[PDB]
Amino acid sequence: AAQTNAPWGLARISSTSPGTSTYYYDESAGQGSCVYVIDTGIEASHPEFEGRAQMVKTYYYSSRDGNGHGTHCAGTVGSRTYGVAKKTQLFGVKVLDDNGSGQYSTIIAGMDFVASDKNNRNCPKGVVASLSLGGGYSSSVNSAAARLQSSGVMVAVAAGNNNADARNYSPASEPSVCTVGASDRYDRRSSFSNYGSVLDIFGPGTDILSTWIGGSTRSISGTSMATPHVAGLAAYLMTLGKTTAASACRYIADTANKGDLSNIPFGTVNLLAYNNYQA
Template sequence: MLVCIPHRIWAYLVFSYLTGEHIPDTPRHNGELPHEEGGVIFVDGVQLEVHPGSWRGPRKINRFVADIVSTGGHSLLNKQLLSPQVYQINVYKMHAALLLSLLPLALAAPAKRAAPAPLLKPRGAEQLLPNKYIVKFKEGTVSASVEDAVSILSAGADYNYGTVFRGFAGTMDDSALELLRAHPDVEFIEQDAVVSINEYTTQSNAPWGLGRISHRTPGSTDYVYETSAGAGTCSYIVDTGVEDSHPDFEGRAFMLASFTSTNTDGNGHGTHVAGTIGSATYGVAKATTIFGVKVLEDSGFGTWAGVIAGMDFVASDYTSRECPNGAFANLSLGGGFSAAVNVAAANMVASGVFLGVAAGNNNDDAQYYSPASAPEACTVGATDSSDSRASYSNYGALVDIFAPGSDILSTWIGGGTNTISGTSMATPHIVGLAAYLAGLLGNRGASAMCDLIRDLATPDVLSGIPSGTVNLLAFNGNPSG
C-alpha cells in the first residue's frame, strides 16, 4: 500500500518544527486547519507534542512513524480522522533533511495483514523455551522493516539472521509476540526449543535381525539405536491379534478391534509380529504404541472381506489417536492377487498410514499376490543370517526392500517367546524401522518413508537375488555401523 502525503503537509511539519509556527494557508482536513496551541501541533484532532531532548534520535522517530503507517491509522498520513486515539511524538528540533528522510519510509510502508502470522512449535520437541521465539520474514523484506520489528523487543534480538533467511530470535512477552504476528512482513514465528546430540544406545545379545539392521556388515549381536526409539508413533498390527498384556510391551500395547469370531490372539503370530515392531527386548521401535486389529482367526486364516474391514478401521482410527510422528500398519499376511485389497492398500497409504506388507512365502514373483503387489505399499522380502535371500521369499520388481526373516526370536502368547520364520517376520522389521525413523527424523509421509528406507539400505550385499529384484538390505542409519 502506498500512502500519499501532500507535500504541503510535509512542508508544514518541517516549518513548524524549525520555527514553532504554522503555515497559514495549509489546506484544511476534515474542516480543521492544522494549528499550534501551547507548543502542541494539532492536525485533524491528532496532537504532535514537542518535548525537545526526550527522544534519543531519529531511529526511534522512524520506528514511531513506521508503526503509525503500518497500522494505517494516522490522519496526517492517510487523510482520515482517527478518534479518540492520540499519538505523541517527542522530538529534537532537527534539521529539515532528517524529517524529510521519513517520507520514503512512509511511502514504502507495507499493507496491514489480514490475519496474524502463524505461530509454530517444533514437532517432537522435548523442551520448549518459554518466551523465546524465532521470527522469519518474507522473501524480499527490506532491512528497515526488520530493524523496525526488532525495536519492538525491549531487550533487542539475541541473534540476527541475514543469509539462510532474513529474521531474528529473541525474548518476547505476549504483547511483543502479538505485535510481531501482526507485522505485515513476518512470514511465521516459531517457538525456540532445546536440541541435543543424537544419543545412541546398544542392546547387547539382541536377536540377530536387530543386530543386522543396525550394522552394514553381518555378524553383530548388538542392536545400536537412537534413544527416541519411535516415540510419538502408532503401530497397527493387522493380524491374529496382539496379547497386549505381555510384559515385554511395557503397557504400550492395546487390542483395539476384531473382525473375527474372537477378540484375542489365540495363535501367536500377531503377538510375534508386534514384538518385532515394538517390544522392549525384541523390537526395532521400542517406544512406539502398539495397536492390535484382529482380522485372522486363531487358525491363521481369514477372508479378504475381513482384512479390508481391518484396513478400513485403521485408516479411520489413527486420526483420533495421539500419533504426532505418524501411523504405521503391518500386514504380515497374503493370498492370491486381489484388486479390492490392492485398492484398499493404495487408499490406506493415501490416507496417511505407512503400510508394510509381506512379499509372500512362495518363492515366486510378488506380482501374483496381494497385498504384496500393491505398488503403494512397502513390500518386504526375507533374508537369513548369512545374507542370502530366504529360500521361501518372494521376489520381483514389486519388492521394495529385504529384511531379516528367518529364525526370528520375538514375543509369543502366554507371556513367552518363540522363534519362527517367514516374510511375515521380515515385514515388522521394516514397519518398526519406519516408526523408528519417524521418531528420529519426523514423519515424512507414508509414501516417502519407504523411499527413505530404501535410500538408507545397504546395497548389493545379498546373495540369491533374481534379476529385476532390488538388492537392498534394511539399515537403521547407525552412524557407527
C-alpha cells in the first residue's frame, strides 16, 4: 500500500534515503496489536482514530486530554492519516495533567497498571507501550519501566530534549527498554535531542504533523514525537510476525538504516528506524 503526500516522517521510515513523500507499508497495518499511550490522555472521539482509540485509566479528575500532547503522540502511532500502524488498537492512560506535568509515583503507577491491564484485553499480535515523557534520574522510575518490559510489553521511551547525555534522565537511562532519539528531515540529529551510549535508535522528531485536540491538527517537535514512530513500527512488525515484544527493539536496530545521520557524537549509535517494505 502507499500513502502519497505523507508527513515527511512516515515517508522517511519506509525509505533508504531522505527527501521522499510517499509512505509505503503492508496493508495489515498493525491489526491485531495494541499500543498503550501513557501521556496526557487521548481525544478518542477524533475522526482520525476511526473509533480505534479509548481511555482506560486516568489519575486525575477527568480522562479527557486537555493538553493535546497525548493526542498528538497517539496520532503518530495509529491515526489514519498521520500514523505508522493505521489499524492498531490504541489505549490511553492519563498520568500527566493538562499542563503536561506529573509526579513520579503517578507515572510508576501507570506503568504497573498497563502490565496488569493487558491481561484483560484481546491483543493476539502483541502489546506496545509508548512513553513520551521523562525527567531527572530515578532508579524507581527505571525499575518500573524494566518491570513493564519484562512482563511482555514492548516499551519505547523518549531520550529527552536537553541536548545532553540521556544517562542522567529517567526512564531514558533504563537499558532494558527502547530509548528513542530524534532526527530532522535532512537526516541531522535534532538540535535538542539527547544522545549517549544508552540510546538504541533514532526516529523523526522535528516538525511532526499529527492529530490535536478540538478535532484539529498541528506540527510540533521533540523526542516525544520520535518515540511513537518507533512504538508504531514495533506494533506493525509484530503483526507481520517478524519479531516479538522481547526482541522488537533489537530487531529494529538490526534492520535500521545505518550511517545515514549527521551530527551524531562518538559513542552514540547511527541507526534510523526503517520498515524494510518491498511490494
